[PDB]
Design a protein around this ligand. Structure first.
Ligand SMILES: Nc1nc2c(ncn2[C@@H]2O[C@H](COP(=O)(O)OP(=O)(O)O)[C@@H](O)[C@H]2O)c(=O)[nH]1
Lengths: 420, 69
């Protein structure tokens, strides 16, 4: 019933996907052996449920990783397509020489997943953008499956690299080389970045020693809450496309922001109630979204919000109307009623109300801006170029990719300008 | 005498019809009084139940001390 294929590329994407599959298992109560305790899972003889996913990377070490944590025993070994070298942080390897040596097998097993399925609605991808494996092999797979499956929609939870959190120094090159190819073959590139997650988990929940575990936990929570209005009944149902029509008025303005609510700590949870006024007052803020693009520094072309729990549609819709007629400056005028809601009658495990928010804003261009910024100060000097020019990559790629970045950011800028 | 025998017929029939209608109206008033108790009691039950559940939640939250391995 509107089944979904689950691709995970790169080490980052794979860790996040493991977290997400274990969160889903926590939701539908599937103990870590695949027994009860079809949109996501496939039945295996014996009443077992194997997640309809697929994992890939060029360093088999990550294999052992997904076999370490709990709920790792679920995935099927007949989908574990892996390499030997490891793309080693370079975008050339995982896209022209070694990536193309495994795209064949990964596309074969994807065809095996899809052609067996009958009710396939959309895809979903989780992959970094600076890491060679994730970025390169995932964007090549995206190109392939989207030239082969045109009608269905895509979902690339790309975790963009923010500069204030320094991991490597070749991030901008791979980032731009991916983003130039994302704008065509992928219709919903919902971005996340570790800067915003660090900020949230520091100054919103007072976490002492945050590690990547809880960050991936928050991203998995957001990803589940996105489509939770599909696997469960609700007074006003929604799905991937109902999101993908109210949120993107153009074939290029399809870059989003994520948000989830509510979040508080032990020494602070005795003081807040749980009603849609409070959840609304929390979800539209800046420190409650997962992108390093201050939303109040622009407007929202559009935004959708999927609720989970059971409330009185009047309170939700009146709260939406109120927040839209209050912060009208931070909203755009040429599109009326630029917000959308979706009530779903199932709350998460252990709460009563929860909100998963998505927003197409004219303020994330800034993000791409700064990345392209770095590109300049790393391209005019042609630094670290020979690692690319050695695998058929020519200079036209970088210049045209920066051109397309500039075009995108100017689009969002003029639409911040565009009024009526 | 006949016209009196008939006027008393009219009078008795009307003073029975009106009492019957008033009885119907009083029965409807009683039915509404009864319906009111449902919204008087379900809300009380839900209030007490929310109190119990949220108190248990506060307890379960506060019951997180330190580990000290
Ligand atoms: N929030 C979060 N970020 C991660 C995680 N794992 C890796 N990242 C980031 O992903 C980037 C490297 O991507 P990686 O997959 O290791 O390189 P690749 O294998 O060549 O694609 C780095 O910026 C890491 O910090 C994770 O589990 N959670």
């Amino acid at each position: 019933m509107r089944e979904i294929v689950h691709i995970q590329g790169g080490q980052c994407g794979n860790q996040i996907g493991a977290k997400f599959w274990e969160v889903i298992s926590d939701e539908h109560g599937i103990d870590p052996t695949g027994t009860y305790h079809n949109v996501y899972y496939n039945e295996a003889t014996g009443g077992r449920y194997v997640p309809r996913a697929i994992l890939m990377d060029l360093e088999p070490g990550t294999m052992d990783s997904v076999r370490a944590g709990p709920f790792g025993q679920l995935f099927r070994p007949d989908n574990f397509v892996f390499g030997q070298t490891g793309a080693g942080n370079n975008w050339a390897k995982g896209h022209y020489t070694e990536g193309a040596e495994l795209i064949d097998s990964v596309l074969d097993v994807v065809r095996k997943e899809a052609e067996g399925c009958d009710c396939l609605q959309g895809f979903q991808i989780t992959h970094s953008l600076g890491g060679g494996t994730g970025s390169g092999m995932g964007t090549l797979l995206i190109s392939k499956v989207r030239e082969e499956y045109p009608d269905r929609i895509m979902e690339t939870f790309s975790v963009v690299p923010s500069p204030k959190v320094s991991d490597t120094v070749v991030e901008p090159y791979n980032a731009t080389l991916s983003v130039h190819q994302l704008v065509e073959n992928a219709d919903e590139c919902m971005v996340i970045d570790n800067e915003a997650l660090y900020d949230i988990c520091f100054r919103t929940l007072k976490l002492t020693t945050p590690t990547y575990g809880d960050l991936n936990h928050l991203v998995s929570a957001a990803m589940s809450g996105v489509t939770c209005c599909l696997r469960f009944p609700g007074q006003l149902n929604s799905d991937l496309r109902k999101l993908a029509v109210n949120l993107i008025p153009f074939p290029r303005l399809h870059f989003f922001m994520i948000g989830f609510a509510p979040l508080t700590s032990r020494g602070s949870q005795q003081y807040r109630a749980l009603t849609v006024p409070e959840l609304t007052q929390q979800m539209f803020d800046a420190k409650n979204m997962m992108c390093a693009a201050d939303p109040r520094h622009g407007r929202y072309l559009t935004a959708s919000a999927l609720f989970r729990g059971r409330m009185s549609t009047k309170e939700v819709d009146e709260q939406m109307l109120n927040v839209q007629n209050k912060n009208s400056s931070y909203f755009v005028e040429w599109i009326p009623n630029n917000i959308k809601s979706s009530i779903c009658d199932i709350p998460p495990k252990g709460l009563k109300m929860a909100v998963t928010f998505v927003g197409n804003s004219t303020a994330i261009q800034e993000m791409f801006k700064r990345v392209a910024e770095q590109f300049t100060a790393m391209f005019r000097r042609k630094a670290f170029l020979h690692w690319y020019t050695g695998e058929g990559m020519d200079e036209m790629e970088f210049t045209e990719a920066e051109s397309n970045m500039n075009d995108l950011v100017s689009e969002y800028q003029q639409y911040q300008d565009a009024t009526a | 005498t006949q016209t009196l025998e008939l006027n008393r017929m009219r009078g008795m029939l009307e003073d029975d019809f009106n009492r019957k209608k008033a009885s119907i109206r009083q029965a409807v008033k009683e039915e509404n009084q009864q319906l009111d108790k449902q919204k008087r009691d379900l809300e009380k039950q839900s209030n007490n139940e929310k109190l119990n559940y949220e108190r248990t939640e506060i307890d379960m939250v506060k019951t997180r001390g330190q580990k000290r391995p």
